[PDB]
Amino acid sequence: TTPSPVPTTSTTSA
Amino acid sequence: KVRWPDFNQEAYVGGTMVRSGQDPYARNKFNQVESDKLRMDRAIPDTRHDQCQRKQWRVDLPATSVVITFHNEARSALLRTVVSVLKKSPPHLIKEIILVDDYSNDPEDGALLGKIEKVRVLRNDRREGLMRSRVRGADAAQAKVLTFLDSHCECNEHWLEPLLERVAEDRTRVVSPIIDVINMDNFQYVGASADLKGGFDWNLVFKWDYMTPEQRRSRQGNPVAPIKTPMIAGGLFVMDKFYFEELGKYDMMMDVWGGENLEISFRVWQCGGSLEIIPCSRVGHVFRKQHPYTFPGGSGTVFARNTRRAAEVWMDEYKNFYYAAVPSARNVPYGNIQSRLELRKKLSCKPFKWYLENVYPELRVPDHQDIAFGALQQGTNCLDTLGHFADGVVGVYECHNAGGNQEWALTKEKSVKHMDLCLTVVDRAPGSLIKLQGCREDDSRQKWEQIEGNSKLRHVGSNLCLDSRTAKSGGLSVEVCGPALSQQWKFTLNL
Ligand SMILES: O=c1ccn([C@@H]2O[C@H](COP(=O)(O)OP(=O)(O)O)[C@@H](O)[C@H]2O)c(=O)[nH]1
Ligand SMILES: *[C@H]1O[C@H](CO)[C@H](O)[C@H](O)[C@H]1NC(C)=O
Ligand SMILES: [Mn+2]
C-alpha cells in the first residue's frame, strides 16, 4: 500500500 | 497564548532531533535532518501564475477551522505546517487550528503547540486513523467552513482566500489547492505540472492523470480558472461545514489511510456537488514513497476493506471492474454498510454510470464481452506499442498507468487489441518477432489465451508463448512455452 505519489506521468505521448 | 513568532522552535524541535550518526529517514520516511534545519517560517517561492496577483478579496469571506490530524509527525514539519497557516492566512479567516493527535507516541508533540495563538489540540486515546480523526476535528469546529491539511504541508502566498471565495459562493463546491512538492530528500519547494489532475484506475488506487489536449488548451485559455476534477488528490481540501455534515462526513468504519478520497469524491459528485482544483491556491506537500507508520490489521487488509466499502456503496455494477483488478478484495470482509446505503438513498444521488459519463469519461471502461483488459504486465514493465503502427514490432516499457500505448484488451474473439491493431503471429517459428497488424475476425494468427492461473499468454492452438527475451534485439517474440521469467504476463483486469 503506497502513499500519495509525487505528481508525474509518462514522459512520452501516445 | 504565545504569538507564533515567539514560539521557541529550537527548544521544541531540539529533543527530538535525529541523533548524530543515525538515519535521517527512519522515523518519517523523509529526511528529518533537512526538515529540522529549516526555520518554521522559511521562505518559499511563489509558484502561482502571475495573473493570481491581480485579485482582491472581500473582507467578509467566511472564516475556517483548519483541521490537521497527525500520527508521529516530525516536530519541525508539524510546526512549519501550523506556522505556514498562521503566517500566510489573513488571521480573521483562521477561526482556529485544530490539531488532532492520532495517538502519537509522545503527546508533547501536540501539547506543546497548544500554547500557540489559535491552536487547539485534541488527542485520541487510541489510534483512530485519518478518517475518524478528521471527523473528530470537524465535529469540534466552530467555523462555518472546514479546511483539512496534512501535517507536512507549507501554505503559499494567498493560498486561503481563493478557496474560501469558491465555497462562499456555492456551498456544494469542495475545493483544493494545486499541490506543490516539498522534496522528501532536500526539502526544496517546487511546482509540478498544472496539466495533471487526480484520477484512478479500476484498482481504485489514486493516480495523477495528464490532461487531454483540449483540457490543456482550455487551461492555457484561463490558467487561473477553477479546474473540475473527478478525484480529490488527497487530502488537502476546503468544504462548507454544513455541507460536510449533510453529505455524511466520512464513513467512520474506514481505518488509518486510503479509500476515503475515493469515497468522498464519488459521494460529492453523485450527490450533486463538485470538486475543483484552484490554481491560485498553492500548498506544498511532502510526498513520500512509503508510509512511516503501521496499519493496525495490516496495510493491505485495511486498504482493501476501505476501498470495498466505497465500491459497494457507490459504484453499482462497476464494482465488478474493481474486483476484476483486485480479485483478492472479494475475500476481505468489509462490515455493515447499511448506514451509508441509507445515506445514499436519503440524498437522492445519481448512478455511478452518470459519474463515469459526466465526471470521468476519460476512465476507459471494458467492453461487455472482453475477457481481460487494461495493461499486460511483466514485472514493472508493460506491453507497449512503442508508438508503432501496422507491420511494427511491440515491446516492453516501464508501466506508466497513463493508458496510451499501454492500453490493451483480450477481446471476446481472443485477440490482443490496441485501437484497430492486434498482436499477430506473422511467423510461427520459435524466436520470431510478433507484429502489430490490423485486427481481423477470423485470423488464427491473432488468437491468444491466458494460461497457468492467468500468468502467461499462449498463442491459441500452439505451444508458443509470448516472450520478452528478444526485447533487446527488436521486440517481443513467440517462444516454446517453458518455465521462464520472460514468459510471465498478467492483465490488470481479468473479467
Ligand atoms: O493513522 C493515521 C494515518 C495518517 N494520519 C495523518 O493523515 C495525513 C495523511 O497521511 P499521509 O501523509 O501518511 O498520507 P500521504 O499524504 O503520504 O498519502 C497525515 O497528516 C498523517 O499524519 C493520521 O492522523 N492517522
Ligand atoms: C510514449 O512513447 C513510449 C515509447 O517511446 C511508450 O510507447 C509510452 O508508453 C508512450 N506513452 C504513452 C502515454 O503512450
Ligand atoms: Mn501526506
How many residue pairs from chains A and B have C-beta atoms closer than 8 A? 59
Let me know how long chain A is. Answer: 14
Residues B407 and B475 in one domain: yes
Report the distance separating Cα B329 and Cα B322, nearest Å: 9
Q: Does the C-beta of B321 come closer than 6 Å to ligand 1?
A: no
B335 and B419 housed in the same domain: no
In sequence order, what are the residues at sequence separation of 6 or more whose Cβ sits closer than 8 angstroms to the Cβ of residue B367? Answer: B373, B409, B411, B412
∠ Cα B233 B239 B243 (to 5°): 125
- Determine the Cα–Cα distance for residues B182 and B248; give it in Å rounded to an integer: 32
- Judgement on whether residues B50 and B131 belong to the same structural domain of the protein: yes
Nearby residues of B131 by Cβ (< 8 Å), 6 or more positions away: B250, B251, B252, B254, B255, B260
Same domain flag for B126 and B259? yes
β-pair type (B274-285, B381-384): unpaired
**Do B428 and B323 reside in the same domain of the chain?**
no
Torsion from C-alpha of B195, B198, B201, B205, nearest 10 degrees = 130
CB contact under 8 A, B387 and A4: no
DSSP letters, B367-419, are PTT-SEEEEEEETTEEEE-TT--TT---EEEE--SS-GGG-EEE-TTS-EEET
Residues B381 and B359 in one domain: no
* Residue B235, preceding peptide bond in cis (omega within 30° of 0): yes
Q: Name the nearest CA neighbour of B95 among B61, B131, B135, B133.
A: B61
Q: Å from B400 to nearest chain A CA?
A: 6
Q: Are B277 and B211 in contact (CB under 8 A)?
A: no
Q: Return the residue matching grid coordinates 455524511.
A: B248
Answer whether A10 sits within 8 Å of B193, measured CB to CB. no
Q: Are B421 and B438 in contact (CB under 8 A)?
A: yes
Number of CB atoms found within 10 A of residue B351's CB:
14
Q: Answer yes or no: do B147 and B137 share one domain.
A: yes
User: Do residues B77 and B157 both lie within one domain?
Assistant: yes
**B351 & B386 share domain:** no
The last residue of one of the domains, among B338, B363, B388, is B363
Final residue of a structural domain among B305, B336, B363: B363
Q: Is the dihedral of CA B312, B314, B320, B322 positive or negative?
A: negative
- Closest chain B C-alpha to A14 CA, distance in angstroms: 5
Q: What's the gap between Cα B327 and its chain centre?
A: 21
Contact partners, residue B115, CB within 8 Å, separation at least 6: B1, B2, B7
Q: Are residues B312 and B174 in the same domain?
A: yes
Comparing CA positions, the residue from B7, B143, B139, B145 lying closest to residue B80 is B7
Q: Whose CA is nearest to atom 4 of ligand 2?
A: B386
Under an 8 A CB cutoff, do B402 and A8 touch? Answer: no
Question: What grid cell was written down for B107?
Answer: 503527546
Nearest to B463 by CA among B474, B452, B477, B478: B478
Q: What is the CATH number of the domain that holds B195?
A: 3.90.550.10
For every residue of B30-69, DSSP letters joined together read S-HHHHHHS-TT------S-GGGGG----TTPPPEEEEEE
Q: Contact, B385 vs B375, CB < 8 A?
A: no
Whether ligand 1 lies within 6 angstroms of the CB of B406 is answered as no
Phi/psi at B108 (5° precision):
-65, -25
Q: Is the dihedral of CA B354, B357, B361, B364 positive or negative?
A: positive
In the numeric block, the cell 486510503 is attached to B258
- CA B23 → CA B20, B53, B200, B440, distances in Å? 9, 42, 34, 59
Q: What is the dihedral of CA B106, B112, B117, B119, to 10 degrees?
A: 10
Distance CA(B324)–CA(B320), nearest Å, equals 6
CB count within 10 Å of CB B346 equals 11
Rounded to whole angstroms, how far apart are CA atoms B247 and B479? Answer: 56
Index of the ligand 2 atom closest to the CA of residue A12: 1
Assign residue B260 a region (left: φ > 0; alpha: ψ between -120 and 50; beta: otherwise).
Answer: alpha
Residues B305 and B368 in one domain: no
- What is d(CA B387, CA B403) in angstroms, rounded to the nearest whole number? 12
Separation CA B30–CA B33 (nearest Å): 9
Cell numbers standing for residue B350: 445519481
Within this chain, do residues B74 and B151 fall inside the same structural domain, yes or no?
yes
Which residue, of B308, B328, B363, is where some domain finishes? B363
Q: Is B334 helix (H, G, I), strand (E, B) or coil?
A: coil
Q: Report the domain count for chain B.
A: 2
Cell numbers for B53: 496577483
B423, B415 in Cβ contact below 8 A? yes
By CA distance, what is A14's nearest residue in B? Answer: B404
The secondary structure of residue B2, as a DSSP letter, is: B
The Cα–Cα gap between B234 and B488 comes to 34
Domain residue limits at B71 = 1-363
